[PDB]
Amino acid sequence: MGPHSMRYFETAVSRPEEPRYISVGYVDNKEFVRFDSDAENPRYEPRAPWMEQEGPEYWERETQKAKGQEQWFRVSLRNLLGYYNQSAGGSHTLQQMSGCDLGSDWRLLRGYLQFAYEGRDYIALNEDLKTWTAADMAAQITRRKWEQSGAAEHYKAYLEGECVEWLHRYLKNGNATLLRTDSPKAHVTHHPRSKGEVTLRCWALGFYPADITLTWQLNGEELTQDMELVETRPAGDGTFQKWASVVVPLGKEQNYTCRVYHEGLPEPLTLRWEPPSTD
Amino acid sequence: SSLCNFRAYV
Amino acid sequence: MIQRTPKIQVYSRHPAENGKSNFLNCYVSGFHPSDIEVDLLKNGERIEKVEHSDLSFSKDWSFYLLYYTEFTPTEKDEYACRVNHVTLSQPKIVKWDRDM
Ligand code: NA
Ligand code: NA
Ligand code: NA
Ligand code: NA
Ligand code: NA
Ligand code: NA
Ligand code: NA
Ligand code: NA
């Protein structure tokens, strides 16, 4: 759904051994490439099978770039120790998210470049792709350095250019697979509680992509705070699961309906609990 | 295509 | 620094049916930093054949992984996930409930 996007999520973790560097690329929220410095032969690898349309030169070039990034994160973690007046030791985490959302003219809609240190927002490039916002005092040092050295122009050129150009290539190559959806298979289960009341649980299983909406109604009217939802979770086969439950009075089960919305469904599913047939 | 960060480190 | 404690869900890939082969999942998410220890347990004992997905992180910077093993649900065997992380003083054990 929505605009097409590309993202690269990068992490460098220092450990009590040099930092571990991990880079994961996404197209439309689906992992498509991955580099991990802790692998036996560290290289960018296809994570979506349609990426095998690329030749061996693509993987070698991406791998060489990852080697540069690994060094950049290593130097940056070292500068970060100095900013917080620390000597080397323990574990520290530096993360980066970057990428683009594709506009209706196939040009950049929104560009992203954000950093976190120790799980806290550190610095980000603003929407204008020209200015920075620093979150703390150490980040103000990075901000002044990047402003004085013309860093934003380098990132803007990537976001507006290369990022959008390659995203279009990936969308073309992965078209068949990328448009694919797996509709949720839905059902309602009935469970006992403490005094005879009933838990109705609406299950949505085996769906793809992960985005979904589960709702409960009592006589067609939406239920809000009485609804328990679990966070969407991976089934392990590339598909997802979710459930939403309501506590109802016994014998009043038929007055309730669940409705599931998903991009795989031509029409949202409306279902109710019915006692299953038994022997 | 992954990004190569600018020459200025954090 | 903001450390985040893991969110845990323990569940099966398919609706559980006693005696039918399935997959037991332990989905660990929303944690920071990335180091985490996860074991799948059968009757309180560590399962040796356990695989896991590769490390990823969400738009809120928090990490997530999936641990899983093939299993067959039964009436008598109890399954669980044991998680440890720097935010905890001791491992957290979450029992598998086939209805959740
Ligand atoms: Na070290
Ligand atoms: Na993502
Ligand atoms: Na390496
Ligand atoms: Na899979
Ligand atoms: Na390339
Ligand atoms: Na079920
Ligand atoms: Na046992
Ligand atoms: Na075992």
Author numbering:
A (entry chain A): 0 to 15, 18 to 280
B (entry chain C): 1 to 10
C (entry chain B): 0 to 99
Paper lines:
By studying T cells expressing natural or engineered TCRs, here we describe covalent TCR-pMHC interactions that involve a cysteine-cysteine disulfide bond between the TCR and the peptide. The 6218 TCR derives from a T cell hybridoma specific for an influenza Polymerase Acidic (PA) peptide (SSLENFRAYV) presented by H2-Db 33,34 and has been shown to facilitate CD8αβ+ T-conv differentiation in C57BL/6 (B6) mice. To assess effects of these Cys substitutions on the TCR-pMHC interface, we solved four high-resolution crystal structures.
The PA4C/H2-Db structure confirmed the Cys at P4 of the PA4C peptide is exposed for potential TCR binding and the overall structure is similar to PA/H-2Db 42, with a root mean square deviation on the MHC cleft of 0.34 Å and on the peptide of 0.21 Å. We noted the P4-Cys rotamer in the S-S bond was distinct from the P4-Cys rotamer in the unbound PA4C/H2-Db structure and in the 6218 TCR-PA4C/H2-Db complex.
